[PDB]
């Protein structure tokens, strides 16, 4: 319906373990929506809060915003690294 960029994405651990199969995703996807897709793939009773990184740069507002600061090879499947958010002291 829109002419925003879409591309293939693959979720994986910090340790490199892939999660699910690749996903076609609009480039303006938010970390909040990435969390919802990740909750589906993990299928846990209570989903952990997650942070998302592409090439060691965190996705804060949108995937497209983070990619604007990188020289990415668009033909390849983009790997997205997820990690649980920190728990702070006391």
């Amino acid at each position: 319906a829109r002419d925003v960029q879409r591309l293939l994405v693959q979720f994986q651990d910090e340790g490199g373990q892939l999660l699910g199969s690749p996903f076609d995703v609009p480039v303006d996807i938010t970390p909040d929506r990435l969390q919802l897709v990740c909750n589906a793939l993990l299928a846990q009773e209570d989903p952990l809060p997650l942070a998302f990184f592409v090439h060691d740069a965190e996705i804060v507002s949108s995937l497209g915003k983070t990619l604007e600061s990188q020289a990415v090879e668009t033909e390849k499947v983009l790997d997205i690294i997820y990690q649980p958010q920190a728990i702070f002291r006391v």
Partner: protein, 241 residues
């Protein structure tokens, strides 16, 4: 430049493997076709680097050898070959005859190193090429040989309109989806999320549910190409009559 010998030798090795398949395809198409007009067929090769990532390079060359020679054996008409990716290249014109030397030339010029897969740009350009040849003389057929992945970088709305514009121009399009069984993920396993509502769980559909081409075949093994593609061409022939 003289090292066209390398390309010619490579094409000859493809002809050795694909010769029986091309005859089976010719015969099966002949049986279907009897059941004065002239045919114009364009073969489009995806020259983007994802073909190397998805290991669909061999399937692409094998398919071109099978299809291009079967159409030549069948004496259907004029064959054009195009490559697309970052730009559109006409590798073989309609009015020139398609021979083994033509196949060697396509082999040398397709290195699958292009950094984009602009399928919408390709479709918008071929309409001018088809329309110019319709008036030079007919049923027109476009066969897209591609991995069918990463097709939405230009925007989904633009890609869908480009497919619709080819149909409105009376061009019949069949997408030949190359799917190597050795690859980690099949194109049937790629998924797409659909969101609705704040914080609500998204619906997980298959990526092929939004494939912008309604007429397609899935090719895992070139040995299945004669039986699968000839069955698919039934729809084109019936629409022409």
């Amino acid at each position: 430049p003289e090292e066209e010998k390398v390309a010619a030798e490579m094409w000859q090795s493809y002809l050795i493997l694909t010769a029986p398949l091309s005859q089976r395809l010719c015969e099966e198409l002949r049986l279907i076709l009897e059941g004065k007009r002239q045919y114009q067929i364009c073969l489009a090769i995806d020259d983007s680097s994802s073909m190397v990532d998805n290991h669909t390079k061999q399937l692409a060359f094998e398919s071109l050898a099978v299809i291009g020679n079967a159409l030549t054996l069948l004496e259907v008409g004029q064959i054009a070959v195009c490559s697309f990716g970052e730009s559109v290249k006409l590798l073989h014109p309609f009015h020139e005859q398609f021979s083994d030397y033509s196949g060697s030339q396509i082999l040398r010029l397709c290195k699958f190193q292009q950094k984009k897969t602009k399928i919408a740009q390709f479709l918008e350009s071929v309409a001018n090429m088809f329309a110019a040849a319709q008036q030079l003389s007919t049923a027109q057929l476009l066969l897209v040989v591609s991995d069918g992945r990463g097709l939405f970088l230009e925007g989904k709305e633009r890609v869908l309109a480009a497919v619709q514009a080819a149909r409105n121009a009376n061009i019949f399009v069949i997408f030949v989806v190359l799917d190597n069984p050795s690859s980690r993920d099949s194109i049937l396993d790629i998924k797409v999320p659909i969101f609705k509502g704040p914080g609500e769980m998204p619906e997980i559909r298959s990526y092929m549910e939004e494939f912008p081409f309604p007429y397609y075949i899935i090719l895992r093994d070139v040995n299945a190409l004669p039986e699968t593609l000839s069955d698919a061409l039934r729809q084109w022939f019936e629409l022409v009559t």
